[PDB]
Amino acid sequence: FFTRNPSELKGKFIHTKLRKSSRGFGFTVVGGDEPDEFLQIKSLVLDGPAALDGKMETGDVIVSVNDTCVLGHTHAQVVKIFQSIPIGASVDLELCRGYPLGSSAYGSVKAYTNFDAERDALNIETAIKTKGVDEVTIVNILTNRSNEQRQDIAFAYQRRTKKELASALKSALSGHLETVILGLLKTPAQYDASELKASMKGLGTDEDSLIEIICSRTNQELQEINRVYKEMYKTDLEKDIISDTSGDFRKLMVALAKGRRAEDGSVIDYELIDQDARDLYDAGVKRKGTDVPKWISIMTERSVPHLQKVFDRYKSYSPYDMLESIRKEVKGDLENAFLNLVQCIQNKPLYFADRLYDSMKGKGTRDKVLIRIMVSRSEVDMLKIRSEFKRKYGKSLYYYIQQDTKGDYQKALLYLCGGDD
Ligand SMILES: [Ca+2]
Numbered sequence: 001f002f003t004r005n006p007s008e009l010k011g012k013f014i015h016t017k018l019r020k021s022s023r024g025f026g027f028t029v030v031g032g033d034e035p036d037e038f039l040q041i042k043s044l045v046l047d048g049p050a051a052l053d054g055k056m057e058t059g060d061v062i063v064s065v066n067d068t069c070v071l072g073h074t075h076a077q078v079v080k081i082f083q084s085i086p087i088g089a090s091v092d093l094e095l096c097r098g099y100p101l102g103s104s105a106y107g108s109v110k111a112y113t114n115f116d117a118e119r120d121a122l123n124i125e126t127a128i129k130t131k132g133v134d135e136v137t138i139v140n141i142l143t144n145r146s147n148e149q150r151q152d153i154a155f156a157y158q159r160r161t162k163k164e165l166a167s168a169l170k171s172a173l174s175g176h177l178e179t180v181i182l183g184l185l186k187t188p189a190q191y192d193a194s195e196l197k198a199s200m201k202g203l204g205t206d207e208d209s210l211i212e213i214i215c216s217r218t219n220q221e222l223q224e225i226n227r228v229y230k231e232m233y234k235t236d237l238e239k240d241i242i243s244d245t246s247g248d249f250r251k252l253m254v255a256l257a258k259g260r261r262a263e264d265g266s267v268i269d270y271e272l273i274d275q276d277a278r279d280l281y282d283a284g285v286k287r288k289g290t291d292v293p294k295w296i297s298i299m300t301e302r303s304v305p306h307l308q309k310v311f312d313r314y315k316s317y318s319p320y321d322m323l324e325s326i327r328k329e330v331k332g333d334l335e336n337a338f339l340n341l342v343q344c345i346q347n348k349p350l351y352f353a354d355r356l357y358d359s360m361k362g363k364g365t366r367d368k369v370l371i372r373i374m375v376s377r378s379e380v381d382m383l384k385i386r387s388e389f390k391r392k393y394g395k396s397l398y399y400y401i402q403q404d405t406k407g408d409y410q411k412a413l414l415y416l417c418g419g420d421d
């Protein structure tokens with residue numbers, strides 16, 4: 001939720017006066033790198049003038065600076081206002097508290113307020129070394145902390161025990177719960193990198209997990225995955241994909257994994273929307289056979305908002321929509337990969353909603369899929385996923401998880417879900 005009107009903000013307003021000392025005002029701001037996004041306080045230098053006043057907290061939307069509304073201004077515009085303020089001069093700040101964090105706007109796992117890593121690290125050490133292992137404590141803490149906070153915990157635990165938190169939990173847990181907790185301990189790039197490497201272990205590759213991660217990850221995410229993957233496994237992600245795929249499926253996976261999709265522009269390119277739609281039709285349903293490289297080219301290179309509009313314009317040319325046309329034109333891992341891709345382009349939270357429903361709908365559970373989605377989307381769009389799930393399937397994601405899983409495993413997943421609908 002965004003609004004550049006102070007008359008449409010719901011939270012509480014806070015007036016504050018700060019003098020810029022030698023180390024700046026003493027706080028870090030975040031947000032504003034988008035068209036419509038707030039500007040919230042990230043961190044406060046506890047020895048700076050910002051933390052001295054005590055009336056500014058993390059998560060406060062900056063409504064105005066020096067009698068000028070900065071709601072809707074970019075990140076570089078309000079940063080130049082505070083830097084032009086010389087040393088010793090005053091700045092006036094109207095803030096607004098009651099909004100989340102922008103980044104984790106639609107996540108289910110939010111940052112824990114009174115965070116104390118040293119207390120968490122001890123409580124987890126006490127849980128580990130309790131006779132019979134206190135799994136409930138380990139689950140209650142780690143699933144109610146942000147991934148950033150779990151990194152501080154693993155650091156504190158290592159300083160205290162001289163042992164890695166991941167190693168200690170590996171030797172204390174087992175089964176599905178172990179997989180959940182160890183996944184939650186990795187950074188998003190680390191977790192995705194490890195999931196990708198696991199999907200390519202052995203001769204037979206898990207094409208379903210490779211497709212899920214490569215198709216759903218963004219340019220920024222894929223950039224970091226590629227960096228961390230070579231860090232961990234001493235090889236480029238691209239080469240491992242080349243080695244474990246072939247044909248057009250390899251072409252599609254290598255192109256997506258580059259994370260070089262065009263970024264969403266400021267102008268809608270209607271002539272190109274229509275030409276790309278026409279090109280997708282001529283290359284498949286219109287003709288005998290399929291021009292797969294043309295599909296791969298358009299669907300990996302255009303920005304997501306662009307491709308959403310070409311798929312609707314594609315309906316003007318083809319009697320089948322893009323999903324139907326994929327099934328009609330192509331088969332196998334290529335078909336699966338295309339289907340997953342344009343699902344992620346049209347509606348990604350719905351795409352995960354269906355993946356979660358598919359993992360639970362039948363006999364047993366596809367735990368590897370369920371766990372990976374609950375872990376990797378808990379701080380991204382879990383709230384949107386839960387909305388699409390409830391709207392389509394009539395009951396909540398929480399309800400299905402509760403039926404399909406049991407034990408501390410279930411409790412961990414339910415925490416990552418974040419509540420009923
Ligand atoms: Ca136990």
Ligand SMILES: [Ca+2]
Binds near residue numbers: 172173174
């Ligand atoms: Ca073990």
Ligand SMILES: [Ca+2]
Binds near residue numbers: 199202204
């Ligand atoms: Ca393999």
Ligand SMILES: [Ca+2]
Binds near residue numbers: 287328329
């Ligand atoms: Ca055909």
Ligand SMILES: [Ca+2]
Binds near residue numbers: 359363364365
């Ligand atoms: Ca089931």
